[PDB]
Write an enzyme that holds these catalytic residues in place. Structure first.
Site, PDB file in Angstrom:
ATOM      1  N   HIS A 351       0.776  -1.253   0.000  1.00  9.51           N
ATOM      2  CA  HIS A 351       0.000   0.000   0.000  1.00  9.51           C
ATOM      3  C   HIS A 351       0.812   1.312   0.000  1.00  9.51           C
ATOM      4  CE1 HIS A 351      -3.826  -2.173   0.815  1.00  9.51           C
ATOM      5  NE2 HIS A 351      -3.013  -2.999   1.452  1.00  9.51           N
ATOM      6  N   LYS A 542      -8.663  13.858   4.136  1.00  6.34           N
ATOM      7  CA  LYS A 542      -7.714  12.744   4.122  1.00  6.34           C
ATOM      8  C   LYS A 542      -6.739  13.048   5.252  1.00  6.34           C
ATOM      9  CE  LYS A 542      -6.927  13.766  -0.131  1.00  6.34           C
ATOM     10  NZ  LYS A 542      -6.748  12.541  -0.952  1.00  6.34           N
ATOM     11  N   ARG A 543      -5.982  12.047   5.692  1.00  3.90           N
ATOM     12  CA  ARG A 543      -4.977  12.273   6.726  1.00  3.90           C
ATOM     13  C   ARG A 543      -3.993  13.358   6.290  1.00  3.90           C
ATOM     14  NH1 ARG A 543      -4.658   8.344  11.119  1.00  3.90           N
ATOM     15  NH2 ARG A 543      -2.735   9.504  11.606  1.00  3.90           N
ATOM     16  N   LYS A 548       0.553  14.439   0.551  1.00  2.14           N
ATOM     17  CA  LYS A 548      -0.817  14.713   0.105  1.00  2.14           C
ATOM     18  C   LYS A 548      -0.998  16.204  -0.218  1.00  2.14           C
ATOM     19  CE  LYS A 548      -2.804  10.784   2.681  1.00  2.14           C
ATOM     20  NZ  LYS A 548      -3.628  10.079   1.601  1.00  2.14           N
ATOM     21  N   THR A 650      -8.552   6.397  -2.252  1.00  4.29           N
ATOM     22  CA  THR A 650      -9.891   5.831  -2.373  1.00  4.29           C
ATOM     23  C   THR A 650     -10.928   6.906  -2.127  1.00  4.29           C
ATOM     24  OG1 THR A 650      -9.820   5.051  -0.078  1.00  4.29           O
ATOM     25  CG2 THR A 650      -9.286   3.433  -1.812  1.00  4.29           C
ATOM     26  N   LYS A 654     -14.756   7.917  -3.931  1.00  7.96           N
ATOM     27  CA  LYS A 654     -15.955   8.319  -3.194  1.00  7.96           C
ATOM     28  C   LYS A 654     -16.563   9.623  -3.744  1.00  7.96           C
ATOM     29  CE  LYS A 654     -13.733   6.322   0.943  1.00  7.96           C
ATOM     30  NZ  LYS A 654     -13.172   6.730   2.282  1.00  7.96           N
TER      31      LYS A 654
HETATM   32  O1  LIG Z   1      -4.699   0.877  -0.644  1.00  8.37           O
HETATM   33  C1  LIG Z   1      -5.436   1.621   0.330  1.00  8.37           C
HETATM   34  C2  LIG Z   1      -4.701   2.922   0.644  1.00  8.37           C
HETATM   35  O2  LIG Z   1      -3.552   2.616   1.439  1.00  8.37           O
HETATM   36  C3  LIG Z   1      -2.905   3.791   1.948  1.00  8.37           C
HETATM   37  N1  LIG Z   1      -1.860   3.330   2.861  1.00  8.37           N
HETATM   38  C4  LIG Z   1      -1.996   3.465   4.185  1.00  8.37           C
HETATM   39  S1  LIG Z   1      -3.342   4.238   4.903  1.00  8.37           S
HETATM   40  N2  LIG Z   1      -0.996   2.979   4.915  1.00  8.37           N
HETATM   41  N3  LIG Z   1      -0.931   3.018   6.148  1.00  8.37           N
HETATM   42  C5  LIG Z   1       0.096   2.495   6.670  1.00  8.37           C
HETATM   43  C6  LIG Z   1       0.322   2.467   8.125  1.00  8.37           C
HETATM   44  C7  LIG Z   1       1.591   2.143   8.613  1.00  8.37           C
HETATM   45  C8  LIG Z   1       1.811   2.115   9.989  1.00  8.37           C
HETATM   46  C9  LIG Z   1       0.754   2.406  10.859  1.00  8.37           C
HETATM   47 BR1  LIG Z   1       1.035   2.387  12.731  1.00  8.37          BR
HETATM   48  C10 LIG Z   1      -0.512   2.729  10.372  1.00  8.37           C
HETATM   49  C11 LIG Z   1      -0.731   2.754   8.999  1.00  8.37           C
HETATM   50  C12 LIG Z   1      -2.288   4.536   0.766  1.00  8.37           C
HETATM   51  O3  LIG Z   1      -1.628   5.702   1.257  1.00  8.37           O
HETATM   52  C13 LIG Z   1      -3.412   4.912  -0.218  1.00  8.37           C
HETATM   53  O4  LIG Z   1      -2.883   5.469  -1.422  1.00  8.37           O
HETATM   54  C14 LIG Z   1      -4.236   3.685  -0.607  1.00  8.37           C
HETATM   55  O5  LIG Z   1      -5.353   4.099  -1.404  1.00  8.37           O
END
Ligand SMILES: OC[C@H]1O[C@@H](NC(=S)N/N=C/c2ccc(Br)cc2)[C@H](O)[C@@H](O)[C@@H]1O
Ligand SMILES: OC[C@H]1O[C@@H](NC(=S)N/N=C/c2ccc(Br)cc2)[C@H](O)[C@@H](O)[C@@H]1O
Ligand SMILES: OC[C@H]1O[C@@H](NC(=S)N/N=C/c2ccc(Br)cc2)[C@H](O)[C@@H](O)[C@@H]1O
Ligand SMILES: OC[C@H]1O[C@@H](NC(=S)N/N=C/c2ccc(Br)cc2)[C@H](O)[C@@H](O)[C@@H]1O
EC number: 2.4.1.1
Lengths: 810, 810
Positions: A351, A542-543, A548, A650, A654
């Site tokens: 991811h 978004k976060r 971003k 994602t 939406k």
């Molecule tokens: O595929 C779904 C989405 O995945 C997201 N990855 C995320 S939220 N990782 N979190 C990683 C993470 C690592 C350590 C901790 Br403790 C908490 C979260 C991508 O940024 C998006 O582009 C994508 O659409």
């Protein structure tokens, strides 16, 4: 009231009313005189949940009798949000419950607001797991979600003096009506100890034991009577734990801390022991449960025919050495057979490409906590590297690049390398992301085993993300093309033949206006903030992350403000600019960005010359329930990550489904969205991946942009001089310094194109008819982004199972 | 099957069966194929609890409409045991449920064994609270029990190698079907901080806040449709608590530790801060709840007309300064008016004379934790001592003896002195105990305020302690005198006219034999130990304490063994000697006594010469559910505390009601038991209180007894030489040393009389007819010891309320 919400039959309404009264009395121990609004919510939740029970028992029974291949989706995050409306939607009970509660003198929407989000995730990855569960149930797959029942989910965000404050999300405080504890499946999980090598193999001894107690939550499919299970593990001390006396009992907290809280640090991998414990805990408990179910069908050759394990990022990567451990140490399979089984069972989804997010566990941690797993990982590594050496003889640098073990100050295990080695399939989550994996970060692995690498473009469930959150839009669509699109989203293409339909154009625009009015009113009631509902709703939720580029958005906002101040009596399209999202508590720059946004708001919103032409609002406590409100209300979706940084996104999907136009870079799934809708129907700007690469080779010099763009210079000067922080003139010096000297994400390089593109957005919005026709063209081509399509691809190309839209008997 | 268990009507049985199936399906999410025995228990518990709901709502509603004076029973202990059978008994549902479950193919008694004891108490004081709640509901009093919902109750006791091991009593692990959380009545409790004196009085500021969340449990009266409430508080951190991030969330445990565990140290007062916090926590939350209910009726003159607070020992003594604090600081009443209200509201029950158990809190603890309460206590003390000085001018030693503040190394607050000062009534719990209070430890207070001092002899509920645990006995009694005695225990006197009735004699003896067979079988099945059911069941069950003199019992046991070994071929009445009870984890001597008992067993039970003539068994994990089994099975009740040490005892009353004869000292309620039954029908031995006093004046010399009693010398020599611990010859040197040189409880001084009295017990048992007639004479005169009588006395003589045996409408 509206058709897609189901029938409100006389018999059903009467029965709902009586079961509601039964629960209020027998379950809540209340009558109408002393019942609180929360009691009413619970009575309704219990009434609705009763309808899941038979379907849930018969679904699991069916899986027992038919013995299909089972799909195990392992994730440390399941970002579920609220369950009540979703359950009503998937059971076709919404109108009936609405009627039933109305007749009882209650407003169901008010009752729905009482439910806490199950906030068991951080953002995209957690929410993806949830959409996936919904789609797996809708597609009739024998699927289980496995994770951790955190006592505390993602923190509630408060804004105090423009700053983010965190408070504990005590989401279980009043009890959770959607879970059932399953104490009979309580399982021991082992930690620490040491390895003994006997005559008959290795033995892991002298361990500390923590119990894993499962809690089952239903996952109903869309009107197919399928109810799958999400099983979440809770940590429990054994009864003889630490067993002066009083302290020993109090110390039980230590063991149970494993499932206490979700790690919110989505920006920076922290090698924290408690996090490692969480990762092993979910993996060890889940694998024992999987094996138990497999035996209740000796011959592990058939294990991969009956079991698929999907690893959601590397967080559950320990499943690979844990499966080996069980197979080799406990079942006494030889290494090579065990390995074949493991590889054929496991698949890995990546991811992100951001290096600081990659899990690289210090060897000394694994040595203490999981000594046997380290040994197994070392053996995996040696055998893997022997394969690399045979394939690429003499390429010694390749050997060190591909090693699972990273040498350096502290030795680390690269968990992504472990996942690729031990999986038959590796996928990225959007076409451009999967290509980047093959070409850059996993290039060596792709060259060794090209067949392993796949793409599975992300999707969202159109149940939560259209029917539930935007029933008005769902209804005007259903009026024209029927209801089938809800579980066959590609049917939305039929809306293309309505782009010139005056009635439909009027209805699409009316639904949006209604959504905006509703959200404008939600803002006044719950937050006492005042917005103009005829303005363009410009939304970035978004976060908070540097990649971003909420900062780029901020720069545009200030540009608009400065232009207004320069020519006050010139007409501009009014905007309400909304930015929301949480920052990881230890991420200083992200917290500074939030403060910047609020500081801009403080100036912009109180400038009399501006009027209601520009408003900047920080959306507090962005979470699934807030997304369900704001997304239907949005006109413009900001998807503006530096090209090559957002794996998929994602949130973008939406907004597309709910009638907002997108301003975005060619990054993640934006590329495929533009491809589906046509580039003419998307507001694309900025560097492509290749342009970013070109800029890096040359060296990125932010000063050059500052020197050549007068409007950008002004903004930077305003930021430096304290225009936006009069009493703390140097407040934003960190932000300026970063932008000027160490911006990994090239905010300045996309600035000019972003501002110009935004002018074209404003131009289109002046022409409501053409704005709406372009909107229709987006909605009509959003079908590819259903998680039903995504899951059908996983099923066929990774899991080896066929989806089915057939009903189970009611 | 048996009459006192109620009707098993066709309609009721059909309805119970269908509601059982409904709960199994909808509540437990199971069908009969996958249901565990525990699921069946829960389905039944939910089925039964449904029947309480209407009565519970209508009882509380009735109290709201009629506004009677409310009784608040404050205790840190409520030793409830199991709830299922008790609820069925009080609702007349037992036979119906038995039939209903039988028809479903289930054994109800087996289901009952699945329920955990609510072990929220240590022994007598905790169990007294529970009997009292049952009696208050049966007598139609508007009564509430208030305490703490401990996550962990009294530890489960395991015996390992003859030694007590403790394990956590995780009684809530599977959920508690008898509680309802009441989150709307969550209340803040304050700790630490400091006192500010403003223009308008004192203010307690800068406090740390812990939330108190109530859980309500029903207390059903006996077939009168009254259901009262026991409300137990649970500690919850506020959401902004400690709000790096992860640690702040984990630290929430600190606040919530307040309600984590019951202190088991019933032998030795420990000034532990956590215990102090528990005591304040229950008091602060309870008083706010009381005041809220009082206002939902400005004028606090009527407060004592509408409120009685009973303090169960000094554990909730902080109610006195807390009530003053609220009245003076928050409501702004003048001191003297506030004090009058407080005194008229509060009453205090003392449960012991042992000095080491008296609560004497260090001033430095109260200064830090509760600074305002300390100030209030100082002011109470000054005003009280001014009254003493005026009443007894020049008596300076009286002033220091009566002070609430004790001077010394560390200054301490004497909580008993606080309770007497701040209460309108002080009572002991048996006639001799109350006399001892007036004559010795509270003599000064009695002289100042003689009207305050009362007696309220303890009692037990004949619902749990006859109908529930001994239905066979209840039934043969009901056959002759009807059912009314169950809530009017004095009616048992009518059994005196049956002492010569051959049918009744036969039935009384048969019921005992059946109880003994049942218990003999329980021992084999759950513990694999083998006993002779024709032997005399000689039972001592109660917490292990030097004052309770389990050691004296041990000496008799060894005497019997030595006599058998001396004349092996002589006939002796076979005995099964059972001793059981928990030791406080830090009480070394008590743990040594347990090991002694098991060590004696190890020798005695495996001596071939002994045969089945003598067996010594340690009853593991003595608790309410075990008491319900062993007490009906007993022939001889050991109540052998040194005269003047057992305030009342209540175990004694349980045995009397269930057809055991008593061997006992003239101590506690034994005196009144002998008085009721006649001394000819009791096995009384040993020093009276006056003889103990005479011995103390002279000085107790254990050596004298050792020198003059050859049989006693032999036992001591066997203990010293390692006869009972061959591999650790000096194991029992602590016990011998204590007995010989520092025995506060004069074990040797009662030895000769005890052994002789035991010979007379054996003599009577040889004549079963005469044994049983004496038994009938005990049962028939046990009526005074109903807690219904006790509660009626509290009501009339302390609380100022009239009991009522009238039904509420069904
Ligand atoms: O595929 C779904 C989405 O995945 C997201 N990855 C995320 S939220 N990782 N979190 C990683 C993470 C690592 C350590 C901790 Br403790 C908490 C979260 C991508 O940024 C998006 O582009 C994508 O659409
Ligand atoms: O909220 C109170 C408690 O409820 C309990 N649920 C019980 S007893 N039955 N549930 C049955 C059920 C039926 C249908 C569905 Br769809 C889900 C659960 C949970 O096990 C506890 O974790 C929880 O704290
Ligand atoms: O055991 C699962 C949970 O059950 C909950 N009880 C609920 S929802 N209703 N009870 C209703 C009730 C009805 C009659 C009686 Br008589 C007592 C309670 C408790 O509040 C939780 O503390 C507990 O953990
Ligand atoms: O009146 C009821 C019974 O009360 C008992 N007192 C008991 S259990 N006190 N516990 C005190 C205690 C102190 C500190 C802790 Br931490 C725990 C318990 C008397 O010993 C009995 O004679 C009497 O029959």
């Amino acid at each position: 009231q509206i058709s897609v919400r189901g029938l409100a039959g006389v018999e059903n309404v009467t029965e709902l009313k009586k079961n509601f009264n039964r629960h209020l009395h027998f379950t809540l121990v209340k009558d109408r005189n002393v019942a609180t609004p929360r009691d009413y919510y619970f009575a309704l939740a219990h009434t609705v949940r009763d309808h899941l029970v038979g379907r849930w028992i018969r679904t699991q029974q069916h899986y027992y009798e038919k013995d299909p291949k089972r799909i195990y989706y392992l994730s440390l995050e399941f970002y579920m949000g609220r369950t009540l409306q979703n359950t009503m939607v998937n059971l076709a009970l919404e109108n009936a419950c609405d009627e039933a509660t109305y007749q009882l003198g209650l407003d169901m929407e008010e009752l729905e607001e009482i439910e806490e989000d199950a906030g068991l995730g951080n953002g995209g990855l957690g929410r993806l797991a949830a959409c996936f569960l919904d789609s797996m149930a809708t597609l009739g797959l024998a699927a289980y979600g496995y994770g951790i029942r955190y006592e505390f989910g993602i923190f509630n965000q408060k804004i105090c003096g423009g700053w983010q404050m965190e408070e504990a999300d005590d989401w279980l405080r009043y009890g959770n009506p959607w879970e059932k504890a399953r104490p009979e499946f309580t399982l021991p999980v082992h930690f620490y100890g040491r390895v003994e090598h006997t005559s008959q193999g290795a033995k892991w001894v002298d361990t500390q034991v923590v119990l894993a107690m499962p809690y089952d939550t239903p996952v109903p499919g869309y009107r197919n009577n399928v109810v799958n299970t999400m099983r979440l593990w809770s940590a429990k001390a054994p009864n003889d734990f630490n067993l002066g006396y009083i302290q020993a009992v109090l110390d039980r907290n230590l063991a149970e801390n494993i499932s206490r809280v979700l790690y919110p640090n989505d920006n920076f991998f922290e090698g924290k022991e408690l996090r490692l414990k969480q990762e092993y805990f979910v993996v060890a408990a889940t694998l024992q449960d999987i094996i138990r179910r497999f035996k209740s069908s000796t011959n592990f050759d058939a294990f991969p025919d009956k079991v698929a394990i999907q690893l959601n990022d590397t967080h559950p990567s320990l499943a690979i050495p844990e499966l080996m451990r069980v197979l080799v140490d406990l079942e006494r399979l030889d290494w090579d057979k065990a390995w074949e089984v493991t590889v054929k069972t496991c698949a890995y989804t990546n991811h992100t490409v951001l290096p600081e997010a990659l899990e690289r566990w210090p060897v000394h941690l694994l040595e203490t906590l999981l000594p046997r797993h380290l040994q197994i990982i070392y053996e995996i590594n040696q055998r893997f590297l022997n394969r690399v050496a045979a394939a690429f003889p003499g390429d010694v640098d390749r050997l060190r690049r591909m090693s699972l073990v990273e040498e350096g100050a502290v030795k680390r295990i690269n968990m992504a390398h472990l996942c690729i080695a031990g999986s038959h399939a590796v996928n990225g989550v959007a076409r451009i992301h999967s290509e980047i994996l093959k070409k850059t970060i996993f290039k060596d692995f792709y060259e060794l085993e090209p067949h392993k690498f796949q793409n599975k473009t992300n999707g969202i469930t159109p149940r939560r993300w259209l029917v539930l959150c935007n029933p008005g839009l769902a209804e005007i669509i259903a009026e024209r093309i029927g209801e089938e699109y809800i579980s066959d989203l590609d049917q939305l293409r039929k809306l293309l033949s309505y782009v010139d339909d005056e009635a439909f154009i009027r209805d699409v625009a009316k639904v949006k206006q209604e959504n905006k009015l509703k959200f404008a009113a939600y803002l006044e009631r719950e937050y006492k903030v005042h917005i103009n509902p005829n303005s363009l709703f410009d939304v970035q939720v978004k976060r908070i992350h540097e990649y971003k580029r909420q900062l780029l958005n901020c720069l545009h906002v200030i540009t608009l403000y400065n232009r207004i101040k320069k020519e006050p009596n010139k007409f501009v399209v009014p905007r309400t600019v909304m930015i929301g999202g949480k920052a990881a508590p230890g991420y200083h720059m992200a917290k500074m960005i939030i403060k910047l946004i609020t500081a801009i708001g403080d100036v912009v919103n109180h400038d009399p010359v501006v009027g209601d032409r520009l408003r900047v609002i920080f959306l507090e406590n962005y979470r699934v329930s807030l997304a369900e409100k704001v997304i239907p209300a949005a006109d413009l979706s900001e998807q503006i990550s530096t090209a090559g940084t957002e794996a998929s996104g994602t949130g973008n999907m939406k907004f597309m489904l709910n009638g907002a136009l997108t301003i975005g870079t060619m990054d993640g799934a934006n590329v495929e969205m533009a491809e589906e809708a046509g580039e003419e129907n998307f507001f694309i700007f900025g560097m492509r991946v290749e342009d970013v690469d070109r800029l890096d080779q040359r060296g990125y010099n932010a000063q050059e942009y500052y020197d050549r763009i007068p409007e950008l210079r002004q903004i930077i000067e305003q930021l430096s001089s304290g225009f936006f922080s009069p009493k703390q003139p140097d407040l934003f010096k960190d932000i300026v310094n970063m932008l000027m000297h160490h911006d990994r994400f090239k905010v300045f390089a996309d600035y000019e194109e972003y501002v110009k593109c935004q002018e074209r957005v404003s131009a289109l919005y002046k022409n409501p008819r053409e704005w709406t026709r372009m909107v229709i063209r987006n909605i009509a081509t959003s079908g590819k982004f259903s998680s039903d399509r995504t899951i059908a691809q996983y099923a066929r190309e990774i899991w080896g199972v066929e989806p089915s839209r057939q009903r189970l008997p009611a």
